[PDB]
């Protein structure tokens, strides 16, 4: 019938039991504005709808309803690549829509076929510092843990753009032969930030290869939590049906977690620590279920979410729970940003859980593990060496410290510092590794087999 | 140990001799006050409680 | 060293037996104390059935078992489930109950006693009745075994004071 | 039967539900999704539905299954990958073209395609038979004891029909029992609700170890079946390794692996690896997997299955304990089972206790520990079997001061401290003698002394030597090693061999990470005889440098001890150790004089 | 009537209004099994029950309710020692039956007659650190504060077993003239624990000495709360009617407190500080009030509760509350345990404020109290010096400090180090204690009265 009332973005409609769960309903206002909603909950003799369109200026006696008869599903096609959409899959490319080859459930997915053969083959991003130190395998969940003293978003454009251009460099190594697609989700983005990504992908010739979903920080929360759900489904259709590796970049996970805190108390339930839901986890897990290698065993959905903490706060529920599901994390340093090293990521608190088993072959070397060890240990001693130097002087500094002092500046200025359109696979990373290491004698390089070393010093 | 190989004989002898007299008086004193308690029990039941 | 541990070990086995003798005696005593109580209790419900099976002697007792339950019941209609031998006895004294209830209440007289076509067992109940709700939710079991058993809770210290005091 | 009143989230309430129990299995809608009634207010039953309640309008029917949610216990457990409420993942792969189970897909807990050969017991018609007595058995294994079929616990009677020898299906009846008319039929499996502990003849304390086959476990503080144990987490860069190795090296009759709510990389690794690896006792037919029954949940699986995960596993372990077998329950991790409780609470609206974890947590852990332990198995001729729980408890706040860890350690009597720095360098396992304890030490050391080892003397001494070494190492830093006696230097020299051989073992080699319980005792014998003799000899006039040159060959052997084979004539007496003892005594006259 | 609903340990009955508070009701399951509960809340035509036994399987109109029509009382007899009981008001172990000569309430005031006259008789544990530094009396309440790395059960048993051998040596001295009885109650601990305890009591003496209440962890939280109440009834009868000194060992007290915590979580009752009830004060009190001398003044109930601390903190609600209420504090230390001290009791914060009531003088020395204070004071200084030895070194510490470091080491290793069956008389302990004092000079022992120091040195 009519709208019974509104309290918040919750709309209470007086209706029998007519819509099924998750059924879209159309609230018809007579003032030239049609609005759509989804029943969030259906109860007896009432339904609770949250509207996709607006949040206020709804009548409580002049509204009429029509039932769409279709529960929420995403129209998935693959002529979606090379197009800009908004947070509900409507195009902001302008001009006619792309439509579907399938309507697939977004709710947890109607078939869920994800890994019980652990990740093999190496995925490069295009940055030496990520690849060698924090290796990512096909369908492996490694996020970027970031903070607010850095532009978290820029660093994110960079990984997306440079990823899947690595795949042609790999075709020459003859490690790949399959078509790579990229799915991009921007959540809670500013207009200016949003345009920055679109223009960057356009330069590289990566725009054709990616679909972008933008949900702006001004659109409803419900729309915003749906945004990754739609993105995880596109990636899955391409992985399963057409046997493609698809890399999905989910920025910003904090926006999504915040949105959930707004809908926590919207709901008639009680939250957990610091006001963030105790069922925050359940929600996050939904993202994660779609993640991994699909059954067919040459297609995958690879996932890199970006999570921003307020000042590296680990008191906050969000890095502590999210960090458990995932297999490592990439930690970014403000101290390096401030010096003016860009990218300013530090590889020492960063981790890849399984790293000798997160690489493949013919697109990596077997020397990968040995170099990750050497690179790591010398950078750490160098961090110690900086502090030491200041106390002792240079007129009392140790000869080993001098090599470590130099190593600290070259690892940062070669491996970490690199351009905004530079691209890297494991072989390229590997050549640059040996030139840093060359300076140390062979007897200081002992975590490496004598075989490898006599060939690459 | 011999006080524990011969103590298994004693495991019942001292258990039996310990209440040999007491089980005869329990069953004795019951047969007397049997009737006397049964009248009290009958009485409580045929009285609305 | 290891002498001392074999020296304790045999003195331990010595006191496991002193303890097991002492436990067999409390077990023989306790189970004898109960065997006697369960033969007192046995005689009372045998005596009671003989009282129950002479109908005319059971008649005021039954009236009273019902009136009693009805005052805990507090409904105008009670469903009484009975033995096939006591339905005839209840029938011949419904008015007396409703009178007798009225005089012992100030609630309202009882409207009806319902003789139901479902009955209590005769190989599971010796006699007595189950007086129940209007929809049979809560029941006051004024059967001979159940009365004797609840009565057992309070009988036990009384019986203990006259028998061992 | 009932009609849906509301679907608010995955919580669905239904009216017109009478004789609805409080653990009642129900199937919601036309689709038949799995759900269970947590609560009841009035006429309305409040159900947590574990599968997506998308497409479910109000007014769909709710059909009672007519009994609680139970798990099936019987033939064809081993070599199957399962859900947290026991649903074969393997069977979905055949049908659906899915790894996981998607919404609106349920299947039975045991496969009905598979048929097993039922052999009658020692009871025939007309015999009275009692709860747990062995009615028959099924044999389908040759590497381990199989599935001996018991008469269902808390069930008695006289057997009207005992099916004779032949192949029957798991589904099909093989028993009818006479107990107040026809009691019911029973089948090859039995159903048991998993939130009810299974009975046994009586429970006992543990006292009885078995082959762990990882040297550090036995040597540092013994590993016992029927034990309670905490192992630290690492989230699959350290956790995974110790779990895989404990399953493979331990030649316990069964192993039941439970992944409560894991990454999904770890679940993927344990299933592919088990047929691939070789038994450490011989036999093929998918070696380790044939001994293994797996419940494997990633965090992505429904939350009730994650909560349920350990309960179903524990019932499984308890079932095999009545057959008379020794079981390792290796559960990973309780923090992840705990996470489920937290989620389920907020959905109901339950108010938790500290750090967002409920108050049902501490009592549910206490109840859980007690189901596990050693017991004399139920069934007429009686055997002994055990259920040993090693549960990992990971970070749940980034520390180990969080409610899950702190609660468990208390009930637990054993802690084994994995070392991160050594773990990142891929020595597994590498247990720290500082943090670790076992309160089982005393009773056990007496058990091995009985059996044949000099075990109490050597284990105690192992600990003291290492503790002592940290304290002497500090005197070397600050004063200097040169001003200290020969005796002290020796205390350290010996500690380094004990550290190198046992503690730094590599579970990537089987001549460096698999040796029997006797073999592990013989190595440790070797090091202790040397310590005493070395201190004796330096006192009678020798020096550290002199001593080192003189011991030579015996010192080299002890260093090389781990590389040696599990046998030399027997796998219980290693002849090379017994003769080594002579070479040491002969060496000590020479060196000293 | 019949069960309306069930929400956790709370059961909703639709009934009639005749029931009284804590009146027993029995729930008849469709299995024909009866389980007992007591009404926690009564309202018109309805009840909330908490069922002791179980918490699931409870139906609707297939289930039935029956009233007992007696509010819960415990059947108490004085023939209870040697006899096996279960924590449920009856044995479910099939042990010797309870019998009744009185049924006594557990509300916390049946007929309760306690101290108008404080304890003056000393009762010894055979352990020096307990007896000398804190003292134990015929009404004393002393909490054993234990940890998750200490073995709580081994110390619990240790104190009890050795206090049974000493206590008849004290009877002969005329410290006593009445019986000793042990009441041991274990509530909701592991099977492994339960078995262990029974084995310990047998070795030392017998199990004829003690009465056993056994409650299993698999049995509910509601059962666990009634378990100590059953112990209290046992002890009060023995003291009152038959002028016996009763010793209660209550393990685990923490087990009982977690139970309280569960019936406010699955209740709508708002909890206080750290998620522990607001009415937590009253629940704990009930156990502790029912202590002291019992009327006739030859009977008594003396308490040793056993607390295991989960975090091992002194900011946790359970250890704090208990401490204000109880007449003493005994702190058992993980660091001593590690070092090889058994018993490994640290007396640094062990304190009694009712120190006078705790000590004896008519069957113990008058000098007992004077020496103990001095010892404690000199131990404390020896700890201040220990921290200073690590920092400063021996390169500035004073002549006086050096004596205090020696005293600390001699004190741990001699006084607190005792055999597993080695019992020390309180008089012999003084002699030991005097050895400890004897190394300090007459100017360092200046705080003590001159009379005592010249008399005994």
UniProtKB/Swiss-Prot annotation, chains A, E:
Q: Name one GO molecular function term.
A: proton-transporting ATPase activity, rotational mechanism
Q: Per its UniProt record, what InterPro entries does this chain match?
A: ATP-synt_VA_C, ATPase_a/bsu_AS, ATPase_F1/V1/A1_a/bsu_N, ATPase_F1/V1/A1_a/bsu_nucl-bd, ATPase_V1-cplx_bsu, P-loop_NTPase, V-ATPase_su_B/beta
Its subcellular locations are: Vacuole membrane
- Output the Gene Ontology cellular-component terms: cytoplasm; cytoplasmic stress granule; fungal-type vacuole membrane; Golgi membrane; membrane raft; proton-transporting V-type ATPase complex; vacuolar proton-transporting V-type ATPase complex; vacuolar proton-transporting V-type ATPase, V1 domain
Q: Which SUPFAM superfamilies match?
A: P-loop containing nucleoside triphosphate hydrolases (SSF52540)
Question: Where, per the database record, does this protein carry Phosphoserine?
Answer: 109
Q: What GO terms describe the biological role, i.e. biological process, of this protein? A: ATP metabolic process; endosomal lumen acidification; Golgi lumen acidification; intracellular calcium ion homeostasis; pexophagy; proteasome storage granule assembly; proton transmembrane transport; transmembrane transport
First-listed, main subcellular location of the protein, grouped into a coarse class: membrane
Q: Where are the transmembrane segments?
A: none
Keyword Ion transport included in the entry's annotation: yes
The UniProt keyword set, sorted, is: ATP-binding, Hydrogen ion transport, Ion transport, Isopeptide bond, Membrane, Nucleotide-binding, Phosphoprotein, Transport, Ubl conjugation, Vacuole
The way it spans or sits in the membrane comes to: Peripheral membrane protein
Q: Does the keyword Kinase apply?
A: no
Residues given in the record as ATP binding sites: 353
What Pfam families does the record tag this protein with? ATP-synt_ab, ATP-synt_ab_N, ATP-synt_VA_C
Query: Extra notes?
Result: Present with 131000 molecules/cell in log phase SD medium.
Note the HAMAP family from the entry: ATP_synth_B_arch
- Stated family: Belongs to the ATPase alpha/beta chains family.
- What subunit structure does UniProt give? V-ATPase is a heteromultimeric enzyme composed of a peripheral catalytic V1 complex (components A to H) attached to an integral membrane V0 proton pore complex (components: a, c, c', c'', d, e, f and VOA1). Interacts with RAV1 and RAV2 components of the RAVE complex, which are essential for the stability and assembly of V-ATPase.
Q: What NCBIfam families does the database record attribute to this sequence? A: PRK04196.1, V-ATPase_V1_B
Q: What is this protein called?
A: V-type proton ATPase subunit B
The organism that produces this protein has a lineage beginning with:
Eukaryota, Fungi, Dikarya, Ascomycota, Saccharomycotina
The gene from which this protein is expressed is VMA2
From Swiss-Prot, chain B:
Family that this chain belongs to: Belongs to the V-ATPase G subunit family.
The function of this protein is: Subunit of the V1 complex of vacuolar(H+)-ATPase (V-ATPase), a multisubunit enzyme composed of a peripheral complex (V1) that hydrolyzes ATP and a membrane integral complex (V0) that translocates protons. V-ATPase is responsible for acidifying and maintaining the pH of intracellular compartments.
BP GO annotations: endosomal lumen acidification; Golgi lumen acidification; proton transmembrane transport; vacuolar acidification
- Can you list the GO cellular component terms from the UniProt entry? fungal-type vacuole membrane; Golgi membrane; proton-transporting V-type ATPase complex; vacuolar proton-transporting V-type ATPase complex; vacuolar proton-transporting V-type ATPase, V1 domain
Q: Which GO terms describe its molecular function?
A: ATP hydrolysis activity; proton-transporting ATPase activity, rotational mechanism
Key words of the record? Acetylation, Hydrogen ion transport, Ion transport, Membrane, Transport, Vacuole
Q: Which residues cross the membrane?
A: none
Residue range from the parent sequence: 58 to 106 of 114
Please, what other remarks does the record include? Present with 2280 molecules/cell in log phase SD medium.
> Does the keyword field hold Ion transport?
yes
Q: Where in the cell is it found?
A: Vacuole membrane
**Highest taxon of source:** Eukaryota
Organism source for this protein? Answer: Saccharomyces cerevisiae (strain ATCC 204508 / S288c)
What is the name of the protein in this document? V-type proton ATPase subunit G
Q: Does the keyword Acetylation apply?
A: yes
Q: How does it assemble?
A: V-ATPase is a heteromultimeric enzyme composed of a peripheral catalytic V1 complex (components A to H) attached to an integral membrane V0 proton pore complex (components: a, c, c', c'', d, e, f and VOA1).
Curated annotation (Swiss-Prot), chain C:
Give GO terms for biological process.
endosomal lumen acidification; Golgi lumen acidification; proton transmembrane transport; vacuolar acidification
Descriptive protein name = V-type proton ATPase subunit E
Substituting residue 86 to G results in: In VMA4-1; is rapidly degraded at 37 degrees Celsius
Source domain of life:
Eukaryota
Provide the transmembrane region boundaries.
none
Q: Where in the cell is it found?
A: Vacuole membrane
Membrane topology designation = Peripheral membrane protein
What would be an example GO MF term here? proton-transporting ATPase activity, rotational mechanism
Natural source organism: Saccharomyces cerevisiae (strain ATCC 204508 / S288c) (Baker's yeast)
